[PDB]
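Teaching note: in complex prediction, the entire set of molecules is handled at once rather than each chain in isolation. The prompt given to students was simply: 'Predict the structure of this complex.' The entities are:
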Amino acid sequence: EPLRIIWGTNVSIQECTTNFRNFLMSFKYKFRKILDEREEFINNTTDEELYYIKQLNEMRELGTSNLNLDARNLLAYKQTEDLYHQLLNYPQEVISIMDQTIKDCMVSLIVDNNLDYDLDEIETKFYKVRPYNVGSCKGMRELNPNDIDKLINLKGLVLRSTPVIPDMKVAFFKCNVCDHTMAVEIDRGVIQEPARCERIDCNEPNSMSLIHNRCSFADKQVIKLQETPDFVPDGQTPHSISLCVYDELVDSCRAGDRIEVTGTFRSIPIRANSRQRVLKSLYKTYVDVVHVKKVITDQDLAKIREVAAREDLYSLLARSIAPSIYELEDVKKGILLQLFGGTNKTFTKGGRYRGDINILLCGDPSTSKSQILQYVHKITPRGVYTSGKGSSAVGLTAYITRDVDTKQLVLESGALVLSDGGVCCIDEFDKMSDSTRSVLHEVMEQQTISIAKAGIITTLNARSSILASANPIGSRYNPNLPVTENIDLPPPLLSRFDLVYLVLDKVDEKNDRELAKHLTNLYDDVLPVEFLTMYISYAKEHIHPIITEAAKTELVRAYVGMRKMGKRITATTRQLESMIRLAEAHAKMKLKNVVELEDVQEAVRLIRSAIKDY
Amino acid sequence: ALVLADNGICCIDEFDKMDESDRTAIHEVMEQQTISISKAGINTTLNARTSILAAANPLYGRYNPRLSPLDNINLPAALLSRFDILFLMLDIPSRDDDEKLAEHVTYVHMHNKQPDLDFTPVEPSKMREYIAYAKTKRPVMSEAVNDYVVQAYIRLRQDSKREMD
DNA sequence: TCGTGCTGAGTGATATCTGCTTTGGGTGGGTGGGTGGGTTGAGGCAAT
DNA sequence: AGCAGATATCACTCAGCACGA
Ligand SMILES: Nc1ncnc2c1ncn2[C@@H]1O[C@H](COP(=O)(O)OP(=O)(O)OP(=O)(O)O)[C@@H](O)[C@H]1O
Ligand SMILES: [Mg+2]
Ligand SMILES: [Zn+2]
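The expected output is the structure of the full assembly:
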């Protein structure tokens, strides 16, 4: 009988197919547990139930096709140890056999179970297998020629990924004489164009045309991978390897992401020049990836509501924001209110009123100010870290650049644009370019960035809050001089921040002693950072407070009283919009849809304390 | 060169003459201990927990007693504050010190060897392996020493405030 | 209406000869282009 | 040296007829 054998070996394809089918049909995780010397963790329900049968059933239910296989499970089964070794040694043929067997079992399940599921849909699908955990991960520097055409594991950091490349699968040809069409498959990238028309009646030789847009294509993408920092032996430039991903694996990993990839180590000849079949002696190595790994519910809503119902929610959130910062309750409260933010109003006849809150953190350099910004970044769902006059940062304004990679013109958005809807923390506000200051003024005034350079006229949304930090001109902030002189910023730009905080490191025996105790000990419940971020996201997404009559009366009375204090002008209309925003944010914090007198009272107090510093 | 200095001391000469871009680079190295690259060509971030050794000259080339220490230093006050220890070295003329210095230099020039014979220098290999052993070691502190350090801190804070007056 | 040549010129086909051109670098040019590469150094200009 | 276009000399298919069966 014809007997099919993998080229260069003595392994029968029929044996591999039957072994894999038996393994898939009958396998339980208890075998893996006993293999891993974890037999005493075996339960009675999950470990005694078929695993891959359930996986196939769930795949059919969800309509997916790809199957994730743990190579160790093959060792966990007596029959498939040889199959595991063959997969490690001859991956291409074994993988093709596994795909066909997976399709066969998928159809056989429906055939045997006489289910009502449509069979034609199944027959027209393509099935694949994605093995992983095939042994210890090697290094990019340990790949010798002996590893060619063998399955390897490699950990690294993604550096770049080319756009989707169309890869040809089936070629479509048309007859120029009889309008007859035929599809010819492609093998090793070689199109098998007919010599002549296949029609008996029309035997016209050499009259076949390839219709490019009517052919079948596939997705391909090339990714550059760099070895992990620990793999560098001395500290030289880390090496890199090229990866290829097809179909579903495309767009499965972005730049800067640490991933683990399983694939086949392959070598391909490189043509000397474009005119000729001549090849270079040296071969190029790459990896044909087959598997990639990266290294709100009802219960969540119930937990959020329970937390909101707590009486001391404000203090709890303030403490959770900055556990490591000592005795800055007011600053933490202001930061919390900024994080929650006010209500964005989209007015017909009026225009746009911003609901963001801006806070300036100025004072002595000894006190902790950058750590607060880092915490705010860690908490805010959206935001970017930047320092004025900083080359490392991407930038505060949109700019037109050249894509070195592609030699293409690309419009890149700045830090403020990327922070749309979030909090943008600027570490060093004091030192900043004039241009950057003008951009900041425009963003805080119009909330949009406009660029009219390089033949492009566009406006980018920048609806983001700002939390900047500043330092005095000298080694300390002089109380005698006014804040404007000390901070060294234009009065206009300094008058746009809703809350201005002057954290000063006055020399006090008690305060110094307590700070020393806190710092040395570093060598009231607190919420996890993840839960706080989720709470902030939910509050900002769902709750929208509205002002009531009592709130209106309280706001009017408070503004009138503040104005009557001072001729010197104690407060301006900006001090009213700031109070409105702060009250709305506080109402947001309590998950309330109505602003009440308590929120207005809290707002007047936070605004007044900053004014008193001013 | 900073990358090669990762997890190690950085030996920077002519610190004051350094360009502002490198000043910002070292500022990022100190405060954040990270090296960040934001380029079209590539975008890689490498951690850098590297110490820095800096040598600089005063603003006028030589220290002027009349001017305050901050005035003589061109670098931003924040960078000076971030430095754990700052050592100021000056050349004060004196008969004895100059005579000993001249004798030492002349002996070194003539005999091509260290003039001192009172003590024998320790072998460099022993010193470096001892340093490695010390680095491998991990100490620990108690509460009493913590309180002593707190007291020293309050005393130093009061003294420094009085001096800065 | 099968078998076996003899004739045959037509309709091929495949075994067989005749002319570029190339690498890359100014020992092919700038009426082939600068998004197919080269490319670091000096020089002049505007915004700063 | 390799590659693409071309010339020309190489066979093979259907064509059909004479003998006899
Ligand atoms: N309330 C506090 N709680 C804890 N640590 C504090 C507090 N105030 C100051 N510190 C300490 O002060 C130091 C300030 O460091 P940080 O990075 O925040 O400085 P900075 O505000 O950026 O300084 P500069 O203006 O000099 O650049 C940190 O060591 C922080 O531990
Ligand atoms: Mg700072
Ligand atoms: Zn045809």
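Point out the following to students. The pocket of zinc ion (ligand 3) is lined by residues A 175, 177-178, 180, 197, 199, 202, 204 (CB under 6 Å). Residues 91-113 of chain A form the longest helix (23 residues).
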